[PDB]
Amino acid sequence: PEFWRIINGDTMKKEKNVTLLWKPLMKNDSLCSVQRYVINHHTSCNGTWSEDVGNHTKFTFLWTEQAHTVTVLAINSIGASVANFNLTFSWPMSKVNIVQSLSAYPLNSSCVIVSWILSPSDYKLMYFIIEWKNLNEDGEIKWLRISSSVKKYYIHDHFIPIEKYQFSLYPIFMEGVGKPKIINSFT
Amino acid sequence: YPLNSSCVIVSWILSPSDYKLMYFIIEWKNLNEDGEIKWLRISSSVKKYYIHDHFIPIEKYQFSLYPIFMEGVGKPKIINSFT
Ligand SMILES: *[C@@H]1O[C@H](CO)[C@@H](O)[C@H](O)[C@H]1NC(C)=O
Ligand SMILES: *[C@@H]1O[C@H](CO)[C@@H](O)[C@H](O)[C@H]1NC(C)=O
Ligand SMILES: *[C@@H]1O[C@H](CO)[C@@H](O)[C@H](O)[C@H]1NC(C)=O
């Protein structure tokens, strides 16, 4: 399952509390079932901590180290999931981003625009995650995987014309997550 | 100019011509999208006629209006993009 993280807490503390969320596997991806869910922790110190979430689809974690690696697996009666995604975050990396511009405009009641230009970087970048939230009401967190090859992408989802949704595009690093560019309303 | 999210007004100024003209022909295309050429027929009399379809304001578009005579075709009047 594609697992995504979110900050819910104060920033002054050296430690950080992180909440994970992932989409439960569907039938074809499950191969007739995916019953337990297992989380394996990892750090730059290489401290591995494996826990079994089970049917629950969210997990809360906290730690004081700058770097920590998460590799969420899935347990099946045949065995654990061989191939799973990854994400790593580092505080010095989290303070730098190379994205320059951001915009949003409803072309329809079911379509909105994302446009962005980026300053050149020095290391490699793999993908972007785009999450948007409504400013009038605090709705559920919604996002979807976006690759780095594409430069301009059509979001196609149901929308309320009177409601104005904030947008925040997050850059991703191999060992870090750069700080997002946050816009409160459509351009 | 884009009046709504899915339309652009087509306005122009027609220079006097010693030879007559019956109608015109409007084209619009995207340089970066490289989409297929679209065309609806426009008479020489109507000034503010326009066609509505789903566009993208950020993208770079290409409109061109040609004058058609009864004996020849005038050179294209090509605009870089909507202002
Ligand atoms: C994380 O998983 C992906 C795909 O399963 C793999 O390509 C990548 O090398 C892994 N990273 C680490 C640090 O294990
Ligand atoms: C809304 O407009 C967009 C413009 O491209 C189009 O792709 C989409 O199908 C339209 N949706 C409806 C429900 O008409
Ligand atoms: C937006 O386009 C025109 C403005 O030129 C307007 O008359 C029309 O009603 C609008 N379209 C929709 C689908 O509301």
Side-chain angles (χ1 to χ4, degrees):
Chain A
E2 162 76 18
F3 44 97
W4 176 236
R5 64 151 311 300
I6 172 181
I7 294 111
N8 190 59
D10 56 338
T11 325
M12 82 69 49
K13 48 162 194 165
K14 190 58 165 163
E15 52 161 279
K16 279 311 280 186
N17 71 298
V18 50
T19 312
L20 259 294
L21 188 45
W22 50 95
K23 182 35 206 92
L25 255 51
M26 71 66 68
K27 162 254 188 200
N28 288 100
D29 213 330
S30 79
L31 259 73
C32 320
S33 288
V34 157
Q35 329 101 345
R36 327 307 62 72
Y37 273 138
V38 48
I39 44 165
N40 310 356
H41 304 74
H42 187 252
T43 37
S44 79
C45 180
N46 218 282
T48 40
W49 306 295
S50 315
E51 281 104 303
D52 199 333
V53 199
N55 81 311
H56 197 20
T57 187
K58 89 93 189 172
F59 174 66
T60 167
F61 199 57
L62 54 99
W63 85 112
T64 175
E65 281 82 359
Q66 323 199 338
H68 180 286
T69 281
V70 181
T71 316
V72 168
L73 304 200
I75 278 162
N76 207 340
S77 147
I78 312 303
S81 45
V82 188
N84 298 77
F85 329 89
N86 264 314
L87 42 68
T88 310
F89 40 70
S90 153
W91 266 29
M93 181 37 259
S94 98
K95 317 302 178 167
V96 49
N97 168 30
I98 54 94
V99 182
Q100 299 320 101
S101 83
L102 82 178
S103 89
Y105 188 81
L107 288 168
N108 213 351
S109 55
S110 67
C111 296
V112 78
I113 301 157
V114 56
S115 160
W116 66 101
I117 68 149
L118 55 103
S119 82
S121 169
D122 79 273
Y123 299 124
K124 164 271 191 163
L125 208 181
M126 51 312 301
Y127 98 107
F128 324 127
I129 179 68
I130 322 179
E131 46 268 58
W132 66 121
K133 286 144 299 302
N134 195 56
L135 73 98
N136 327 82
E137 56 95 28
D138 272 5
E140 54 98 19
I141 314 300
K142 44 208 168 298
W143 35 262
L144 64 162
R145 269 261 299 104
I146 295 292
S147 84
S148 293
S149 35
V150 47
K151 201 83 193 81
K152 149 44 201 153
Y153 141 70
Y154 315 138
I155 317 103
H156 199 349
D157 61 315
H158 158 66
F159 260 122
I160 317 294
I162 69 91
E163 288 290 88
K164 306 306 172 326
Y165 287 67
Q166 89 95 44
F167 270 67
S168 45
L169 205 144
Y170 288 55
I172 292 99
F173 220 69
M174 322 67 71
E175 86 273 352
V177 192
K179 28 72 175 174
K181 283 202 58 201
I182 287 107
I183 180 171
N184 43 307
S185 38
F186 311 99
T187 37
Chain B
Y1 256 91
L3 250 53
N4 271 344
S5 68
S6 40
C7 48
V8 168
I9 174 67
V10 192
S11 165
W12 46 243
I13 322 93
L14 199 153
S15 304
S17 182
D18 55 357
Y19 318 159
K20 293 303 140 284
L21 281 87
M22 303 67 87
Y23 52 100
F24 274 67
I25 177 52
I26 213 54
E27 338 311 345
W28 59 118
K29 196 246 208 164
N30 189 283
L31 289 90
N32 320 119
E33 153 72 37
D34 308 287
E36 57 98 39
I37 299 289
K38 318 164 79 193
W39 45 308
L40 286 280
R41 161 195 201 99
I42 178 146
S43 94
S44 313
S45 73
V46 49
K47 177 78 74 162
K48 271 79 52 173
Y49 177 74
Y50 96 87
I51 185 65
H52 48 42
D53 166 290
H54 66 41
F55 313 150
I56 165 65
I58 320 193
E59 261 285 0
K60 169 59 142 54
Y61 271 148
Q62 204 71 99
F63 331 127
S64 70
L65 179 55
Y66 310 177
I68 179 47
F69 290 62
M70 57 313 299
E71 97 268 27
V73 181
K75 80 202 159 307
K77 161 34 201 85
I78 167 59
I79 195 162
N80 310 359
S81 197
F82 53 96
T83 62

